[PDB]
Amino acid sequence: LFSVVAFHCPCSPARNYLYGLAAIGVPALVLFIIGIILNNHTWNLVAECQHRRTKNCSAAPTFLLLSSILGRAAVAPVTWSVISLLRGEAYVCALSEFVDPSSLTAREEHFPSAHATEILARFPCKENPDNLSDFREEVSRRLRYESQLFGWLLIGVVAILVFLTKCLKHYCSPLSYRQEAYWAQYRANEDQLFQRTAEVHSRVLAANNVRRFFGFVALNKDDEELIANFPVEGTQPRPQWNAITGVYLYRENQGLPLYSRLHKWAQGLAGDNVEMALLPSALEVLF
Amino acid sequence: LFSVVAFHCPCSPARNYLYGLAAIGVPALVLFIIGIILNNHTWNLVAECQHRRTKNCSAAPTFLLLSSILGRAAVAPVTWSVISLLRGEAYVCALSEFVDPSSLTAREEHFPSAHATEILARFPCKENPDNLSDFREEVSRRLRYESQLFGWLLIGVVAILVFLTKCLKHYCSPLSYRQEAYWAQYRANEDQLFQRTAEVHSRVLAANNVRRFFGFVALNKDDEELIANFPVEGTQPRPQWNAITGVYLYRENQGLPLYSRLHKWAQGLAGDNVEMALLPSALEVLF
Amino acid sequence: FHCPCSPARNYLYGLAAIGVPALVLFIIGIILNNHTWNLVAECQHRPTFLLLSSILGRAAVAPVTWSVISLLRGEAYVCALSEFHATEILARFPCLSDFREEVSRRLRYESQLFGWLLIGVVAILVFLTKCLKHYCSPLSYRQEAYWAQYRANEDQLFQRTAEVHSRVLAANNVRRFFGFVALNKDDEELIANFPVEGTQPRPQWNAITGVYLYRENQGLPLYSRLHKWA
Amino acid sequence: LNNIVSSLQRNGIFINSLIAALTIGGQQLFSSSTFSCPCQVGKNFYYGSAFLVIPALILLVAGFALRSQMWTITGEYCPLECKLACLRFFSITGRAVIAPLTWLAVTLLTGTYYECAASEFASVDHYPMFDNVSASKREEILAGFPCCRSAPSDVILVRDEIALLHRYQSQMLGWILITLATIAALVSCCVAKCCSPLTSLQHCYWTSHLQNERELFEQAAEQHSRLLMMHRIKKLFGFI
Amino acid sequence: LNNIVSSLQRNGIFINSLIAALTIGGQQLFSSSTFSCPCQVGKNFYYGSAFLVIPALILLVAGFALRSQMWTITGEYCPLECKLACLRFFSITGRAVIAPLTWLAVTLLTGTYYECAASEFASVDHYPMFDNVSASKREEILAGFPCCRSAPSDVILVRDEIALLHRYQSQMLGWILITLATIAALVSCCVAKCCSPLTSLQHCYWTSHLQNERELFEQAAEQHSRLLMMHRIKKLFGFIPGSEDVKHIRIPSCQDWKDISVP
Amino acid sequence: LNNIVSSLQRNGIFINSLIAALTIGGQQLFSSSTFSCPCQVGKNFYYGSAFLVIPALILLVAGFALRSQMWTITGEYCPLECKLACLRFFSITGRAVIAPLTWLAVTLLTGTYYECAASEFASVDHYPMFDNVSASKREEILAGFPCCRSAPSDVILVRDEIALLHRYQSQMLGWILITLATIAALVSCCVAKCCSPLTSLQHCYWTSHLQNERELFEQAAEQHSRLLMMHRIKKLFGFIPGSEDVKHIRIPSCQDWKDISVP
Ligand SMILES: CCCCCCCCCCCC(=O)OC[C@H](COP(=O)(O)OCC[N+](C)(C)C)OC(=O)CCCCCCCCCCC
Numbered sequence A, B: 001l002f003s004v005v006a007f008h009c010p011c012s013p014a015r016n017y018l019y020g021l022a023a024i025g026v027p028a029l030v031l032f033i034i035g036i037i038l039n040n041h042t043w044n045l046v047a048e049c050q051h052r053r054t055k056n057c058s059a060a061p062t063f064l065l066l067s068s069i070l071g072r073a074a075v076a077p078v079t080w081s082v083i084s085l086l087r088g089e090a091y092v093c094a095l096s097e098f099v100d101p102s103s104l105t106a107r108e109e110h111f112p113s114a115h116a117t118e119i120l121a122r123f124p125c126k127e128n129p130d131n132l133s134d135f136r137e138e139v140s141r142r143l144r145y146e147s148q149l150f151g152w153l154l155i156g157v158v159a160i161l162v163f164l165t166k167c168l169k170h171y172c173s174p175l176s177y178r179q180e181a182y183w184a185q186y187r188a189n190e191d192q193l194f195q196r197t198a199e200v201h202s203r204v205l206a207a208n209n210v211r212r213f214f215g216f217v218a219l220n221k222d223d224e225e226l227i228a229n230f231p232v233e234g235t236q237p238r239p240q241w242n243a244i245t246g247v248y249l250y251r252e253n254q255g256l257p258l259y260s261r262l263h264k265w266a267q268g269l270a271g272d273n274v275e276m277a278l279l280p281s282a283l284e285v286l287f
Numbered sequence C: 001f002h003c004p005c006s007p008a009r010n011y012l013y014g015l016a017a018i019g020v021p022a023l024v025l026f027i028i029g030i031i032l033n034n035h036t037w038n039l040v041a042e043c044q045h046r047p048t049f050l051l052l053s054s055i056l057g058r059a060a061v062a063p064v065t066w067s068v069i070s071l072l073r074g075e076a077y078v079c080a081l082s083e084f085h086a087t088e089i090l091a092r093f094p095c096l097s098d099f100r101e102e103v104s105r106r107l108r109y110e111s112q113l114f115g116w117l118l119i120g121v122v123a124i125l126v127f128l129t130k131c132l133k134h135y136c137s138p139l140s141y142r143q144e145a146y147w148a149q150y151r152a153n154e155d156q157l158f159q160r161t162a163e164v165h166s167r168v169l170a171a172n173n174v175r176r177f178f179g180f181v182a183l184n185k186d187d188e189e190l191i192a193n194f195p196v197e198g199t200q201p202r203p204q205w206n207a208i209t210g211v212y213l214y215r216e217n218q219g220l221p222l223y224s225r226l227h228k229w230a
Numbered sequence D: 001l002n003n004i005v006s007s008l009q010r011n012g013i014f015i016n017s018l019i020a021a022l023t024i025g026g027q028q029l030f031s032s033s034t035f036s037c038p039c040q041v042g043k044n045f046y047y048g049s050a051f052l053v054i055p056a057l058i059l060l061v062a063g064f065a066l067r068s069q070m071w072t073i074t075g076e077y078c079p080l081e082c083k084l085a086c087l088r089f090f091s092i093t094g095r096a097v098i099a100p101l102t103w104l105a106v107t108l109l110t111g112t113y114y115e116c117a118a119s120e121f122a123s124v125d126h127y128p129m130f131d132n133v134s135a136s137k138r139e140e141i142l143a144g145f146p147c148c149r150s151a152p153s154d155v156i157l158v159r160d161e162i163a164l165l166h167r168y169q170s171q172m173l174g175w176i177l178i179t180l181a182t183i184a185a186l187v188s189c190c191v192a193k194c195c196s197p198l199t200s201l202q203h204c205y206w207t208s209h210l211q212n213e214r215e216l217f218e219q220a221a222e223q224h225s226r227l228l229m230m231h232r233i234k235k236l237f238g239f240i
Numbered sequence E, F: 001l002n003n004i005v006s007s008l009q010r011n012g013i014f015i016n017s018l019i020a021a022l023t024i025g026g027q028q029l030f031s032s033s034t035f036s037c038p039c040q041v042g043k044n045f046y047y048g049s050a051f052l053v054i055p056a057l058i059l060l061v062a063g064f065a066l067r068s069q070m071w072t073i074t075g076e077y078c079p080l081e082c083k084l085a086c087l088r089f090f091s092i093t094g095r096a097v098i099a100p101l102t103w104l105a106v107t108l109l110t111g112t113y114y115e116c117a118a119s120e121f122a123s124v125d126h127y128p129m130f131d132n133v134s135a136s137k138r139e140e141i142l143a144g145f146p147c148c149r150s151a152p153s154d155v156i157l158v159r160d161e162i163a164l165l166h167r168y169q170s171q172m173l174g175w176i177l178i179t180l181a182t183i184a185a186l187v188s189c190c191v192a193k194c195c196s197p198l199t200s201l202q203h204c205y206w207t208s209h210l211q212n213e214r215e216l217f218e219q220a221a222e223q224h225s226r227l228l229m230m231h232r233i234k235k236l237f238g239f240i241p242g243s244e245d246v247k248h249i250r251i252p253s254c255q256d257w258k259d260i261s262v263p
């Protein structure tokens, strides 16, 4: 529920800004992590640093993609820190103990100087003396001003940055803006179909193994059509799979574009030692 | 939801007017940015300077199009800032500290001269002296008058501007409004077919590449029709894509009008060195 | 609504509150029509007061009613007269009981005395002006009815004319790029139904656009510039 | 049910009945909206005279302007043909002037419009208190009391009898005007049944032919244009 | 259900009941809205007399004039023919007069019109307190007490009594009128059953013939007019209205438009 | 469901019940609204007598009059035919007289009309308090107390007694009337089962035949009128009304309109 994740300000000195940092930074940290995990463009980058094992690719291609990973990942932390600031509860809690008594106004000098830190820190929790009520409301509007000002400024910077990157991304892109639209349409169609056939190819392969065990497979109406229409003969080799996973930056062959590593592999432009073998070489098997 | 997106005046001198600027100007600014991004005319304008890299186009062709895009996307800021001025909260909050107590009338001069700015600042937040409630009501109806007076004028100004461009467009344009209506139909409807074919071409291209991987493609009921009806062989080169990207201004050939760059390229009026190749020259490949 | 009772400044608020919104609405109506832009085509290309006043009054209906509904409330006029040191107190009535109420009766009397003057002008305009124009014109209402319906039906057919022909031309351009068109089932027979032979040059479009006033020859009536084009 | 409504619409009795109802409804709202019985000492009869006559005659102009039969009458007028125009004018007239008499009757039976109009014309000879030999304050207070001035000065007895005498005279006028209008409607109806060359059944036939003739020609005129555009488009781009 | 409603409409009884109910509602609304019962010392009997009689006359004239049968009878007037015309005029007389009679009966039952109309004609010789030897204050107080002048000065009880008397008298008058009306109706029917040349079967047949003939004549006239104009337009524009004109088009000249301008 | 309702309307019991209910409701509303029990000392019996008797006669005359067969019966009156006419009049008498007796019974059982009617006819010899040697104030107070003048001056008990007495008498009359009517009804129906020549089953069939021939004759007369009128149109304009008249158009001359002016 919301009450479980609700904000409860600890009206204590040198304590509330720790909580405000944790109650806001951690939910921003998690949403930043989730953006990285769900994005596919980071795993092929990880796969890139895995298979090469030599740092063959330079830093320039990596930097332009790491920005793409972090650029899309950072939407959720930003739109979460935006709303938290616009609420103002987190900021007034955190900076209540740093309000200057000298800067306090709208009231005569009735603000006690005995425990300035202690008295100020309890303002958010309405635990304020009646002689200090105007002082409490003065802080309640002063700190909320800085909270919302930073809230609109952070939207302003982000909205400018989104405009700034996209303007420069098109300008520095060797391709036109309409071929990238076609390229974006192909990559969506390649991934949609590839995941569709992967489910079907696995199911037909799994059904062939289950048939070998029991002698028959209990298949519904739709699963019957898959076996008849789409028959498989064997599994794809590991190097074939490794030749389509990774990072690809618009390589072109004979004046004709290639849009993905799967497209590049299908043109034959991608492809002694035995690895992770179940059993040793046939010469060793004999003995 | 609506509570977060609201105005909350911080009653403080030299601090209330900054909030009015940010809480109103930034929402206007972001809404301005959204319109610029979504409009396609800016990207082909960017693509114009992208491909030439030589400043072939003069200032006059860019002068109209640069203003054309900004004005068409400025609809969101005006329809927002009008509402803020109609409410009047931003203007009364921003100009509260600039109200001259001398100009206040309809009452005996009960306003103290000790801190005139401080007292006037706290009027919007209901922190107003009862003996100055009329002064609050005087200022409340004074600045709110100015908020709407600029608000109504701004609605008038845009209406005059919208008249001025549309009236001046027909007179200065070399084409009749009826023909331009036909031309506007072409551009707004050719792109509907061009984007529809790109999805089908990509889907066929994606299907022709997944088949090379697994040996079969799992296609939906509609998708088999696309493969049978539109079987593709290869792709279109990058220069062929560059010939249909950019700004077009009613170029005519032999008395037959051309309506778009794609039409211009179709007639053949738009179209050795190897760039961004996957692999080097075939002479180097042999070694 | 908001009624700023400040002295020496309410009259500016009153004028802006009834005048600016009225003219803006007169604007939106005249964008919405297409007949006004027809005269723009003729004047740029090259006895025309009859049409100019006709189109202007067609879109002037809604700005007037907002002006009339403004004076139905009557608060706009009472502020201007009351404003015109007790003068501020007169302006501060809406926001000495006998003197303040003495003028207030005159304010509402003056405010209502102007509202029906406009309604008289509209009543005179809609009645008197409409008969004098139609009586003087030699064309009968049956001729006029065929005139308005000729233009009204031709644009609807022309837009249907333009839409189908444009889809034939555009699909030819797309096929030049990819090699096929992702046309739908309805669009499937569209290209085969109408094989276009050529496009219409600029003078052909320019010849049919403009204002036309029965430039008849050979006894066959002509109603629009497109009629004389053929 | 819709067919029944259309048949009722074909009957002018419902049109007149509905028009009177909206005029009464609009009048009752408007009398309490911005009338106020304005208290002008100098010239207050103008306000009452304006509200008594002008709103009524405005709907007369509205009735004439909203009907196209008068347009054909004036075009021909600017014998049997002239005589038929008079009958056509007579039929349009009945629906044209029905609304103002409803407005005139309702306002005058209300009484408030004429009390605030002819108050300055009241006579003070019956009242020994309103001597006022100066001849200045008498007219000031005379235009003052009926508007909003209760004036608790033992003169209120004057204003009720003035109001009651005004109210009574107001009722007699409308009922006489309504009776006069009814007699005028009767005799004009009698003139239209005597001078008309048509019979009691032939006139209905002629009117039926007129109403049937406008619609048939108008729909055929619409078809004639549409059909011509269809060839024009065929000659224009080559499709139908 | 709609057919049942139409059958009830054919019967006159529901129609007269609806007319009476509408008159009752109108009387109640008018009495609630605009009576005000003025005291006008001089002219007060005339106010109530007008409010009692004039609405009855307007209802009578509206009822009689709204029926086209009365117009046809007057046009024929302007033997057997005289008798049939008289019977036809008398047939709708009851529906014509049912509204003003209901108006009058309701007003007399209410008694407020009779109270504000016949107050100045009250008797004062019985009351010694109403001597008023001046012969002037008597009439002003007589006209002024019924309206709003309560004046609880040992006079109200007296005035109350007079009101009661008038109310009582008012009721009687109304009752009497109703009785007479009923009798008149009966004798009228007797004339309708004594001076009528038609037998017990010919009257309904004649009325049905008139109604049916008027309806079929108007429908046939409308059809013939429409048919004549389809032919006129067929001559005019070269094609039949309501048909397909892919065959011939006249393309008329300017002089042709004036030809159809005769009617 | 509608057929069942149409079956029930054929039954006279449901109709008599609906009429009784409407009369009871109307009596209740009239008594609660426009009675007011006037305290006219001089003439107070007239008001109660009118309110008690006159509406009964009005309802009775209405019950006779709105029945169409009454005029036919009177015309025949104006052997076996006489017996049939008398039996038809007796049959309609039940519906004519069901309503006024319901009115009288309800009014008498309620008692207020009788209390306000015969108050001044009461006797004061029982009560020594109403001495009144003057012979004037006694009738004043006697006609004054019943309506609204309670006057709690140790006389109300007597007034109360008087009211009760009158109410009691009123009640008796009502019941007596009921009883009398009932006996009359019985013997009346007995006469219809003795003087009539037809049998028990022959009468019901005969009435059904009468209703059927009347309705069918009216419909046939209307249809014959329609056939005649339409024949007149096909003769005049040359086409059948409501048919495809695209064949010929007469275009009659001016004189032809006078031809159809005969009826
Ligand atoms: C709930 C919705 C609310 C509306 C606001 C969110 C809109 C979401 C859609 C636009 C975002 C987007 O997609 O941004 C895209 C770009 C990425 O550019 P790139 O690295 O070149 O990737 C190339 C583009 N790709 C990914 C399509 C291939 O982002 C940025 O550069 C910045 C993102 C803004 C947040 C982080 C700003 C910097 C940190 C903060 C500094 C104070």
Ligand SMILES: CCCCCCCCCCCC(=O)OC[C@H](COP(=O)(O)OCC[N+](C)(C)C)OC(=O)CCCCCCCCCCC
Binding pocket: B067, B068, B069, B070, B071, B072, B074, B075, B076, B078, B079, B157, B158, B161, B162, B165
């Ligand atoms: C959310 C919708 C609500 C409805 C109300 C708005 C209607 C929108 C559609 C009609 C208006 C429109 O789009 O105007 C369009 C024109 C653009 O003219 P251009 O620059 O030559 O562009 C060429 C026209 N093209 C793009 C079609 C080729 O605008 C203008 O001239 C200016 C915009 C007016 C607002 C900003 C004023 C200037 C900034 C502020 C200065 C004080």
